[PDB]
Amino acid sequence: MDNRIKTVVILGGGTAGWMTAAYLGKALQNTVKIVVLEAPTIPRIGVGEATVPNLQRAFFDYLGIPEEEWMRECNASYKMAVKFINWRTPGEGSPDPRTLDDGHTDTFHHPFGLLPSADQIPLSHYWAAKRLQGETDENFDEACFADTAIMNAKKAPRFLDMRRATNYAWHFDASKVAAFLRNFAVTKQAVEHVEDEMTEVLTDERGFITALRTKSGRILQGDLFVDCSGFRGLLINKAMEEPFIDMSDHLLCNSAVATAVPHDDEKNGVEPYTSSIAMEAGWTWKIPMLGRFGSGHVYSDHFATQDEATLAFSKLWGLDPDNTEFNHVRFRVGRNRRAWVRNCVSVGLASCFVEPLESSGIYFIYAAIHMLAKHFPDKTFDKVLVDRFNREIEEMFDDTRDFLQAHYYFSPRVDTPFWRANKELKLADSIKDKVETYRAGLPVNLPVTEAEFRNFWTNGSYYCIFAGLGLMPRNPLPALAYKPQSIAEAELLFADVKRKGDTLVESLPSTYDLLRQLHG
Amino acid sequence: MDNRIKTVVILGGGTAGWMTAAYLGKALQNTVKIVVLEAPTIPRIGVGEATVPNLQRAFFDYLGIPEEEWMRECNASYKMAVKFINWRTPGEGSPDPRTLDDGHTDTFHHPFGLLPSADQIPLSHYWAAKRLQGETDENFDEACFADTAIMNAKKAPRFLDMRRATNYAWHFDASKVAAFLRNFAVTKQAVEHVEDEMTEVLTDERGFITALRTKSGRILQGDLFVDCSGFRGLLINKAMEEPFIDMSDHLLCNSAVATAVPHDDEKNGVEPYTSSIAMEAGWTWKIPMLGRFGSGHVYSDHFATQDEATLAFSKLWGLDPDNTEFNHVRFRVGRNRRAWVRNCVSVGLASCFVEPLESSGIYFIYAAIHMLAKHFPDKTFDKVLVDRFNREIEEMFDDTRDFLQAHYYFSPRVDTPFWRANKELKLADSIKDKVETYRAGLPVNLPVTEAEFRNFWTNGSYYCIFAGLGLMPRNPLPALAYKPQSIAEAELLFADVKRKGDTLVESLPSTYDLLRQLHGAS
Numbered sequence A: 001m002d003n004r005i006k007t008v009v010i011l012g013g014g015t016a017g018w019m020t021a022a023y024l025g026k027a028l029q030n031t032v033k034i035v036v037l038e039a040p041t042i043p044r045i046g047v048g049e050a051t052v053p054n055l056q057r058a059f060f061d062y063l064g065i066p067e068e069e070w071m072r073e074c075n076a077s078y079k080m081a082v083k084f085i086n087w088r089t090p091g092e093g094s095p096d097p098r099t100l101d102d103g104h105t106d107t108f109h110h111p112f113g114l115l116p117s118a119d120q121i122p123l124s125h126y127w128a129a130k131r132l133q134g135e136t137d138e139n140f141d142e143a144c145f146a147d148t149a150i151m152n153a154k155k156a157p158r159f160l161d162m163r164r165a166t167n168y169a170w171h172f173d174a175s176k177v178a179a180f181l182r183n184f185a186v187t188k189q190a191v192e193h194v195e196d197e198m199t200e201v202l203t204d205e206r207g208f209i210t211a212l213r214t215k216s217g218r219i220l221q222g223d224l225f226v227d228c229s230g231f232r233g234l235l236i237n238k239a240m241e242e243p244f245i246d247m248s249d250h251l252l253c254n255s256a257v258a259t260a261v262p263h264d265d266e267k268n269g270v271e272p273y274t275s276s277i278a279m280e281a282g283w284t285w286k287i288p289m290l291g292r293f294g295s296g297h298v299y300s301d302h303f304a305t306q307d308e309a310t311l312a313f314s315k316l317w318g319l320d321p322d323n324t325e326f327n328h329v330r331f332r333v334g335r336n337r338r339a340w341v342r343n344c345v346s347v348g349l350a351s352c353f354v355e356p357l358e359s360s361g362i363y364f365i366y367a368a369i370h371m372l373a374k375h376f377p378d379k380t381f382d383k384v385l386v387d388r389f390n391r392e393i394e395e396m397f398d399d400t401r402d403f404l405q406a407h408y409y410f411s412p413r414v415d416t417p418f419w420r421a422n423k424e425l426k427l428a429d430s431i432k433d434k435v436e437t438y439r440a441g442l443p444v445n446l447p448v449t450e451a452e453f454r455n456f457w458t459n460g461s462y463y464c465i466f467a468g469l470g471l472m473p474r475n476p477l478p479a480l481a482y483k484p485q486s487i488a489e490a491e492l493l494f495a496d497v498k499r500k501g502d503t504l505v506e507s508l509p510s511t512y513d514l515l516r517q518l519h520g
Numbered sequence B: 001m002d003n004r005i006k007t008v009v010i011l012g013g014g015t016a017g018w019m020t021a022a023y024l025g026k027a028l029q030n031t032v033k034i035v036v037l038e039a040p041t042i043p044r045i046g047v048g049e050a051t052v053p054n055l056q057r058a059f060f061d062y063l064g065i066p067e068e069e070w071m072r073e074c075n076a077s078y079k080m081a082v083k084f085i086n087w088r089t090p091g092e093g094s095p096d097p098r099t100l101d102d103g104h105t106d107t108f109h110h111p112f113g114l115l116p117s118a119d120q121i122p123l124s125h126y127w128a129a130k131r132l133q134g135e136t137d138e139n140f141d142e143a144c145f146a147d148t149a150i151m152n153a154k155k156a157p158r159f160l161d162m163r164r165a166t167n168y169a170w171h172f173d174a175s176k177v178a179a180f181l182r183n184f185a186v187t188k189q190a191v192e193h194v195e196d197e198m199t200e201v202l203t204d205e206r207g208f209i210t211a212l213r214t215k216s217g218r219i220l221q222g223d224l225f226v227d228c229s230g231f232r233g234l235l236i237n238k239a240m241e242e243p244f245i246d247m248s249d250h251l252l253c254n255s256a257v258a259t260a261v262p263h264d265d266e267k268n269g270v271e272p273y274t275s276s277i278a279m280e281a282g283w284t285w286k287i288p289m290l291g292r293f294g295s296g297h298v299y300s301d302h303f304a305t306q307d308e309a310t311l312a313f314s315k316l317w318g319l320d321p322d323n324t325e326f327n328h329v330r331f332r333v334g335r336n337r338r339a340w341v342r343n344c345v346s347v348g349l350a351s352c353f354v355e356p357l358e359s360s361g362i363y364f365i366y367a368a369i370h371m372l373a374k375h376f377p378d379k380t381f382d383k384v385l386v387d388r389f390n391r392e393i394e395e396m397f398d399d400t401r402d403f404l405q406a407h408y409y410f411s412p413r414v415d416t417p418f419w420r421a422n423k424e425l426k427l428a429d430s431i432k433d434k435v436e437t438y439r440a441g442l443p444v445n446l447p448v449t450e451a452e453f454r455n456f457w458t459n460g461s462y463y464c465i466f467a468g469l470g471l472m473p474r475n476p477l478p479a480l481a482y483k484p485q486s487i488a489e490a491e492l493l494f495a496d497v498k499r500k501g502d503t504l505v506e507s508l509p510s511t512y513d514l515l516r517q518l519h520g521a522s
């Protein structure tokens, strides 16, 4: 008896939809019919985008697509961290860092460099102990990651022989990634591409979807439906009546204004990182690419009108407020009660979302798809398959939401009503527990070298954001008081970070030069 | 004012005690005074203990003690698995397997070999699909591990050149491991050994221990106390008054009768595995070493009297009850509500315990030790360090309690009250959750190759036990129906098991011959 899913209908032709078609195309080995229904009429988000390092391994590698192939197609650039600018100090927006009391610029990094360990203790803890004992004033990113010296010099993460120097994620234009995966899906995975608008969702009496009707009159039948229709959530929210859980009491930002600023790569090179530039009522991203950089001011629409934000955004880069090609989007912050209901699976903005502070959005998509491939059902829609998928989404999303909440709740700024309101907010119990662990000087979420998605943000990453913002431990890791040999060892690791950080800038090619050989 | 712990007092000098002293002696880098108070007691028959593969990485390697060096000191032998004999068929115990309704012997293995994967799916899942679809008649352990063929031939997990062939753990007389560690702490880390009986625990107004009185009139001052006093929990249960949570409503067995049996190694060879031989009111371990095997009937004393168990144990091996030297113990099952209270940390039998069906005892020691070192305090005894250590202990203990529940609740024997009463136990929520996941065809706790202690028992292990006992998923993993190529890729994996089983059975030395060379007996 064949009780398999025979047809999969994906509603949506943005990044979520085509990622889904590309990945299920590879995963279901031409046993299922895959249809993408997408309205050219209804724009897709596409704003210039950044990612995290597992993208290549957990997605493109699955598709059999080498990095340098996809990268060359979407004008892709290298990302080694998020660099935070003017998060600690008061004032209006500026690209340039204000000065701290110690005379350092108000900047701190969030690299993806893995912290070295000595005696089963990561370097961060050795660094925190010397700090709290008055034996060093040096900053955490400068002391613990060579990457920092590479980024400040704007050098690349690869040599010209393409030998890897450091860990890195990607910047790219979303549209181009969408377009690349659309061609891939259609011409290599044989996905049917339907260009039209859905007008009606047909369900049966048990509340399962049977087809989507299009304005042209075609009826697209299917056994499984994936909702990549964006924030409107036309299947999961509208048709299935799954409620969205609003979480504007955990993160306040709900709006953005973006554009693509052109840029002189011969003069200033290219920064190999995403900058996140604090503002009075939020922050602004900057995503360097060959010839241009994407940017956008994320803000709360309770603390600023579309005007003020557009104006502050425009001031930042010296843009004309009245004749610029702006991109205004209001966004959901939260997750659906249940991500997958009956025979509808939400993926993308139809599912969960947080502001783009740590580049969560594309990660969420390929993690949800992977979760769906693993729990892929037949027509009986086993309750346990659906519920384990849903528990996995739930955990992945709360992990990230708390890590983001950590960026705002510990910030010292109190100059504007936005920043003050970010301290009135209640922290989820799980983040408070981790803060407690941290304050006791213990590690939070030690790395383990699938289940990455459950605990994606490691000790290294909590230290960048806590110690960067100035949240320190109450005291040093107590065990270190008994470990004079391990402390000496860690002095060698600290030297090793400086000697490597010195050696690589002298030998490494600039980011621009590396993007020259890669691209046109 | 220096806030560090200057003196650590360990009560007890069995395995828990001397592992604690040696590990702390390395971890605290001679900045702390370590004192072991323990009573001489007496010397007893070594009924043998079995272990799991991390013992060397997580403990002996930390101390810089090479495998061969410590094995040579405790007549150790190799363990590639636990082998379950007659857990599916009724009747009195026999070392020899009974024959199942389908013609197979009633034996199944729990190896330590990690499973291979095709398309991010464990080979177990390919086996279960074929099995539920009628495409293989083969057992899980035969299908998915070459260790099964190596064990059936009694071949060693290493070659004579000492090159590794399989994953394994150890068999040994733990009294000797304790004596070897005692020597190492005393000669190489200047531990203070006080051979005396503790008679009083002194405490201050806030409930903290300040010193231990001995019979001879010592008052041993300390800042941190480790309770390694055994089941008595003299510090954590008596002095600190921390309740033990009895958990005999999750696992029934609470007793053991054990002896060491001389063995003809030139005749029978040496099994590289621990055997679990099902009995009417329990089960009996067989833990081979060179020259003898340790053995012991674990039982519930609600369902059997000591004399009954002891007689059934003897009959199993053809022993003369009156001419055999037995050790007899009644053990508690559970954990202390908090393993660490104030300045008293409990380790070993003083802390938590479960029957030794899957070799949890020494594991619980070095795991808790490791957790103590990670959360090692000063004299402020920050309540977050104490609470996180306790969190880890109970998560470690529940993982293992869950795993052991799976062994009994899914046994299809109904022939005696003991076996029936196993099926009227309440499963914990988390083991029930795993069963559901398994029953839906999904993986259970997928492997990821520190934090191993959270999630130690992985998908392979849950399949060895579930499938061994007869609990199958209700239907294959559904994704597999859509993956004709992955299925074919797993067929090659199945073939690599068979071939590697053929080669290693031909090329490996007998476990006997390897032991002879390692212990220098030939």
Ligand SMILES: Cc1cc2c(cc1C)N(C[C@H](O)[C@H](O)[C@H](O)COP(=O)(O)OP(=O)(O)OC[C@H]1O[C@@H](n3cnc4c(N)ncnc43)[C@H](O)[C@@H]1O)c1[nH]c(=O)[nH]c(=O)c1N2
Pocket (backbone or CB within 6 Å): A011, A012, A013, A014, A015, A016, A017, A037, A038, A039, A040, A041, A042, A043, A044, A045, A046, A047, A048, A049, A050, A051, A174, A196, A197, A198, A199, A228, A229, A230, A231, A232, A234, A255, A256, A296, A329, A331, A347, A348, A349, A350, A356, A359, A360, A361, A362, A363, A365
């Ligand atoms: C301001 C901002 C900034 C970022 C991000 C979001 C936001 C709001 N993200 C998230 C990321 O952009 C997002 O995950 C995808 O790129 C686009 O999401 P979707 O495909 O789900 O919806 P999207 O809205 O993009 O597409 C919806 C699709 O559904 C179709 N549709 C809707 N209604 C229809 C109907 N009735 N009939 C037919 N079709 C219909 C649309 O036409 C379209 O094809 C992100 N992530 C990241 O990793 N790093 C980053 O830097 C950012 N940056």
Ligand SMILES: Cc1cc2c(cc1C)N(C[C@H](O)[C@H](O)[C@H](O)COP(=O)(O)OP(=O)(O)OC[C@H]1O[C@@H](n3cnc4c(N)ncnc43)[C@H](O)[C@@H]1O)c1[nH]c(=O)[nH]c(=O)c1N2
Pocket (backbone or CB within 6 Å): B011, B012, B013, B014, B015, B016, B017, B037, B038, B039, B040, B041, B048, B049, B050, B051, B174, B196, B197, B198, B199, B228, B229, B230, B231, B232, B234, B255, B256, B296, B329, B331, B347, B348, B349, B350, B356, B359, B360, B361, B362, B363
């Ligand atoms: C039946 C059975 C079978 C097994 C196991 C246990 C049991 C009960 N174990 C567990 C393992 O054998 C055990 O945990 C350790 O070997 C010994 O643990 P302790 O040191 O905590 O107790 P243990 O009882 O050995 O030591 C207590 C110490 O405290 C001392 N003491 C008590 N009161 C005192 C006082 N007032 N003053 C001074 N000193 C005092 C004692 O004298 C002794 O030195 C096991 N594990 C495993 O990993 N695999 C296996 O196969 C088995 N098998």
